[PDB]
Each structure stands twice: as structure tokens, then as C-alpha cells.
Design a protein around this ligand. Structure first.
Ligand code: NAG
Lengths: 143, 190, 285
């Protein structure tokens, strides 16, 4: 089996804390730019538990590495977001020894599109970050 | 300018959104509180507890049961036939909420001590109850297993005519600091 | 209409006359015309034009006509992502005296099949000497990886394929590429790097073999080995042109989290290649 470093609960947390600290405007002003993203809550089987997780972070990674993301978030907090997403991914994926991941991804496309629509706006960006944070929390009820 | 600032903590197991005002010339008299969320696009509910309250705080223990959602809230204060101002803010319970220690008593015996932790009888978070036993230089942390009104953990294998100090406290996470219960000390019968 | 089966690699549909392609979403009531896929001699349908939700469960119809008669063929329902194949990665090789630098990127860039999954990419490599046929296999490398310990003036060939761990999807090998390592550099690179800390300052040491040399040291964010496009090796500034085999700077220059480091000997005229990279975790005490 795979045993994460004792300090991985500490890793998944630091992502949430960053996603928090990246907040730019008052989520009030954006209650108009809201949207149900239809997250696949039903998810959250140890092997699955890891796939779904690795499934998600890489996506969170992919979504916040964008040319555009770099233009709506202070760069410092991007780099540490990215550093702690890679380090989580890296030793999770080290366990490559031996609907599902697909619902997760259609889900993430929505977010990719929903933005293109709302035209990479300030509020559009909050909505996402915030949304991501929820989903991550939910995700994070897996230890 | 004018800024409202909010404290959200769990006291006696009751969530409690408080708030203070800074740089307000005319301080209101009554406040009303609204909150919504971001996940689905609803409209502000109006907390009934806290509609038109004189007190500078609210009891959200029944409206905000989810750790994994983000609650955005509008406070407004009226001082006369008027709406003085309206500020906003949001909270993530998993981050913003402080967790006050519960009430506890201890009772000294020959070979052991008896901590009774007075919970209430009635939602919940991923918290862990610590009971901390301080002797000379020593400090054995005790975390018992899973809130039922009075709760009794038994500190055992203790040396008589020795002195002990009990501290109690809930810790949501390693990272976030923890509030410790005031110290209570007894002496074991010989 | 007789059921024809299609296999998808990348953004294309390969069937295995002139054809017209149409598709219907699940709960099918209507058929959409695939543009660029109608009245075409070729079997392969390229749909990197909308056709979003490769994720959704589409059904494909194909019309094939011989002479003046049209034959109709439907296809079993499928989600294209599930049936898709990672085409041959793109490879560029950079040559050194004793190392080959590899920069891989998905072929057919800006694909709609990969989209977001386009950074999830984990490649695996196969490499051998022209003469000796001796083949070392390397697995799960990120998009940028450099291979060391290679004899100079030797032609090495290699071929690689992309893979996605979570998806479990795996696909085609690149075509083999070959490069001849350059003529051995007189200045071997500095070697045996080591990060330790003194007081509140960072100390970084390594082993050069030639006295009287000035060195330049640079770093990179650790994760940035993953993304395949864009990535500059910022040079740690105290280290600028040090005259000795060690460099020290205060721990501050680096904020939390990982970095990479390499160190290069220059004698002002010619310059040695770079040292092997070192993962550094600012949380190394
Ligand atoms: C590899 O060697 C073969 C003969 O064994 C020769 O045909 C081929 O051209 C060589 N390729 C390179 C790139 O040296």
C-alpha cells in the first residue's frame, strides 16, 4: 500500500488556506455572478479515494496554471498554491503500484467554460476560487 | 471610513457570530442579519433570531450547519426611521471559527482523577477532545473517544499525595492554534 | 444501417466512396452535422471545432456513397474521452557532451480531447546507442527531463510515449529521434551539490576539480518541470560570479516550498555545462 508522509493532512490544508488567502474582492459584490456547478458530491474504497483525489488536484492545478489565472491572482500565492499542489500530487501519484474520474472532469470543464462566458471577470474568478474551495473541503473529508 | 468586523466562534457548542463597529459616529440601535451561500444562487435568508436585535451579535447554530460551504452575510443597522449602513463579509467555518473549551470539573481520588466534561444533550465538526494532565514538569495529553450531556473520562494510574492540574480543550486542527481551558487543580488522597 | 466501429486517437475518428459524419447526444432526438467531416474521401474525422463535451455520450452516424447509391451506418454509443488515444508526443532533443536534454509536448497542440487533461501528461522513455542497441528504459518522466551519463560523440536514438495515470489511458510511441552528443567539454561541470544551513544563512557547496574558477548558480521553482510551454532559470544573486567552491546567502531569498538548483563553472572564456539538478525544500533544517 501507499503511506503518505505523516504530514499530508498538513498539505491538503495549506492548499485550502492559500485558496483562502488569494481572495481579492468581497464575495458579496458577486452574488449576481453565482452558479450551481453541480459537483459530484456522491463521491465522498481506498484506491478510488486516491484516484478521485489525484484526479482533482491535477485539475485544480491545471485550472490555476493558466495564462489567465496568472492575471487574476497575485503571483506569490499562485506559486505556493502550485508548489503544494505538485508536492501533494507527486507522492500521491507515487502510488502507481499494482462516470468515475470522468464525471469529475466534465465538472471541471463547466468551470473552464463558465469563466470564458462570464469573460474572465473579477467576480467570475472569485466564484470559481470559492467554488473550488467548497469542492476541496468535501474532497478533504477523506483521511 | 466605516468598517464592521466579525468574530465567529463556537461557545458552549452554539455557533456565535458577533461584530464590532469602528469609526462610526452614529452607532445604530437595531441590527438585522442576512446570510446566503455561493454554491447555489439563492437569496439572502434573514436570521429571525437576529432580526431587529439590540444586542451586537447572533446565534447561527441552526442556520449554518455546513463546514464545507461559504456563508456570505450582510449586516445592516438602523438607528431611527433609517438604514444607517450595510456591510458584508463571508466565513468558512473550517477556517474562521474558533472553538472555545467546554465546561469541566475534576474530582480527586487515591489512585486516579475524575474529569467530567459538561457537554449538552442534542450537527458536529471534526474536533477532538483533549484532557491535559499536568504534574511536576509533566503533561500527559489525553484524548478520549467519540457529546452526551455530562461526559466522564477517567485519568488513571495516578500517584497519591501527588498534585495534578487538569486542562481541557477542543482542537479542530494541528495548524490553527487552540484555546485552553482555565486550570483546575486538586490533590490526591493518600 | 450496419453498425460500423470507430476508434479515436487524439482529436480524430478513424473508421476501420465519400463520407458524411453526423452525431446524436444521449436522449437523441436530433442529428448534428460534423463540419469538415462531410462528403470527404478520407475516413478520419477531425473535430477540433466545438464538439465540446468529448465527455458526453454521443452516437455517430456515417453516410457512405458509392456511385449514385448511399449506404447508412450507425455506431454504438460512446464517450470519446473513454475511447481516445494519446497520439505520438512531440519531441525535441538538445545535445551536450555527456547529456541529452529532452523537451516533450503533446502533439496536435490545443486539442479539445485533452484540453484540461493537458498538463496531467506523464511520458515514458526508451533510449539506446546507435551502435550498441543497448536500451535503457525510463518511466513516468515529466514533460522536461534531461538524461545524463552519456558517452560523448555518440549517437543516441530514442522514442517516447505519453500516458495518464488517473485515466489509465495510454498511447502511441513517437517516431524515433536521434542526436549526436557534442565533443567533450574541457571544463567538466561542477558536481556533488549540497544545501545546508549556517546560522540563519544558506550555504551551498560542490566539488570542482580545477583551481582558479568563477561559478554562476541558478534556481527554478520545483513544480515548473511539469508544464511544457512558456520557465526561466532565475539566478540566485549573491551567488553571482563567486570565486570559490561554496556560496552562502540568507535563508530569506527563498520563501517556503521547493526549488531546484544547478551550478556552472566558467573561466571567463569557455563555460562548462550545468550540474545535475537538486531538489531543495526550504523546510530542510
Ligand atoms: C545507425 O547505424 C546504421 C547502421 O547500423 C545506419 O544505417 C544509420 O544511418 C545510423 N543512424 C545514425 C543516425 O547514426
Amino acid at each position: 500500500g501507499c503511506d503518505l508522509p505523516q504530514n499530508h493532512g498538513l498539505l491538503s490544508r495549506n492548499t485550502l488556506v492559500l485558496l483562502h488567502q488569494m481572495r481579492r474582492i468581497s464575495p458579496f459584490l458577486c452574488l449576481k455572478d453565482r452558479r450551481d456547478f453541480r459537483f459530484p458530491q456522491e463521491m465522498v474504497q481506498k484506491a478510488h479515494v486516491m484516484s478521485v483525489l489525484h484526479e482533482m488536484l491535477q485539475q485544480i492545478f491545471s485550472l490555476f496554471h493558466t495564462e489567465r489565472s496568472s492575471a487574476a491572482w497575485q503571483m506569490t500565492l499562485l506559486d505556493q498554491l502550485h508548489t503544494g499542489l505538485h508536492q501533494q500530487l507527486q507522492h500521491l501519484e507515487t502510488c502507481l503500484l499494482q462516470s468515475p474520474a470522468l464525471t469529475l472532469r466534465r465538472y471541471f470543464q463547466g468551470i473552464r467554460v463558465y469563466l470564458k462566458e462570464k469573460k474572465y471577470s473579477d467576480c467570475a474568478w472569485e466564484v470559481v476560487r470559492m467554488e473550488i474551495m467548497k469542492s476541496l473541503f468535501l474532497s478533504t473529508n477523506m483521511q | 471610513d466605516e468598517s464592521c468586523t466579525f468574530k465567529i466562534s463556537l461557545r458552549n457548542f452554539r455557533s456565535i457570530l458577533s461584530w464590532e463597529l469602528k469609526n462610526h459616529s452614529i452607532v445604530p440601535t437595531h441590527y438585522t442579519l442576512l446570510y446566503t451561500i455561493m454554491s447555489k444562487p439563492e437569496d439572502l435568508k434573514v436570521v429571525k433570531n437576529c432580526a431587529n436585535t439590540t444586542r451586537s451579535f447572533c446565534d447561527l447554530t441552526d442556520e449554518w450547519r455546513s463546514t464545507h460551504e461559504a456563508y456570505v452575510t450582510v449586516l445592516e443597522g438602523f438607528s431611527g426611521n433609517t438604514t444607517l449602513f450595510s456591510c458584508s463579509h463571508n466565513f468558512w467555518l473550517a477556517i474562521d471559527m474558533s472553538f472555545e473549551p467546554p465546561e469541566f470539573e475534576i474530582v480527586g481520588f487515591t489512585n486516579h482523577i475524575n474529569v467530567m466534561v459538561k457537554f449538552p444533550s442534542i450537527l458536529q465538526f471534526d474536533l477532538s477532545l483533549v484532557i491535559e494532565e499536568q504534574s511536576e514538569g509533566i503533561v500527559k495529553k489525553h484524548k478520549p473517544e467519540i457529546m452526551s450531556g455530562n461526559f466522564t473520562y477517567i485519568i488513571d494510574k495516578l500517584i497519591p499525595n501527588t498534585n495534578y492540574c487538569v486542562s481541557v480543550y477542543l482542537e479542530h486542527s494541528d495548524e490553527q492554534a487552540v484555546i485552553k481551558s482555565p486550570l483546575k487543580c486538586t490533590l490526591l488522597p493518600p | 444501417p450496419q453498425k460500423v466501429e470507430v476508434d479515436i486517437i487524439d482529436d480524430n475518428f478513424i473508421l476501420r466512396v465519400t463520407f458524411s459524419f453526423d452525431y446524436q447526444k444521449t436522449g437523441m432526438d436530433n442529428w448534428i452535422k460534423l463540419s469538415g467531416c462531410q462528403n470527404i474521401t478520407s475516413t478520419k474525422c477531425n473535430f477540433s471545432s466545438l464538439k465540446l463535451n468529448v465527455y458526453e455520450e454521443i452516437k455517430l452516424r456515417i453516410r457512405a456513397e458509392k456511385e449514385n447509391t448511399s449506404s447508412w451506418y450507425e455506431v454504438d454509443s460512446f464517450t470519446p474521452f473513454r475511447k481516445a488515444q494519446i497520439g505520438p508526443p512531440e519531441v525535441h532533443l538538445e545535445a551536450e557532451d555527456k547529456a541529452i536534454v529532452i523537451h516533450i509536448s503533446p502533439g496536435t497542440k490545443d486539442s479539445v480531447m485533452w484540453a484540461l487533461d493537458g498538463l496531467s501528461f506523464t511520458y515514458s522513455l526508451v533510449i539506446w546507442k546507435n551502435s550498441s542497441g543497448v536500451e535503457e528504459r525510463i518511466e513516468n518522466i515529466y514533460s522536461r527531463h534531461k538524461i545524463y551519463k552519456l558517452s560523448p560523440e555518440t549517437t543516441y536514438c530514442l522514442k517516447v510515449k505519453a500516458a495518464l495515470l488517473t485515466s489509465w489511458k495510454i498511447g502511441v510511441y513517437s517516431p524515433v529521434h536521434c542526436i549526436k552528443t557534442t565533443v567533450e567539454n574541457e571544463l567538466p561541470p561542477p558536481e556533488n551539490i549540497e544545501v545546508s544551513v549556517q546560522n540563519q544563512n544558506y550555504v551551498l557547496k560542490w566539488d570542482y576539480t580545477y583551481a582558479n574558477m568563477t561559478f554562476q548558480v541558478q534556481w527554478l521553482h520545483a513544480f515548473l518541470k511539469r508544464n511544457p510551454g512558456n520557465y526561466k532559470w532565475k539566478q540566485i544573486p549573491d551567488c553571482e560570479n563567486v570565486k570559490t567552491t561554496q556560496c552562502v546567502f540568507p535563508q530569506n531569498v527563498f520563501q517556503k516550498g521547493i526549488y531546484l538548483l544547478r551550478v556552472q563553472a566558467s573561466d571567463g572564456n569557455n563555460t562548462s555545462f550545468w550540474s545535475e539538478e537538486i531538489k531543495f525544500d526550504t523546510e530542510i533544517q
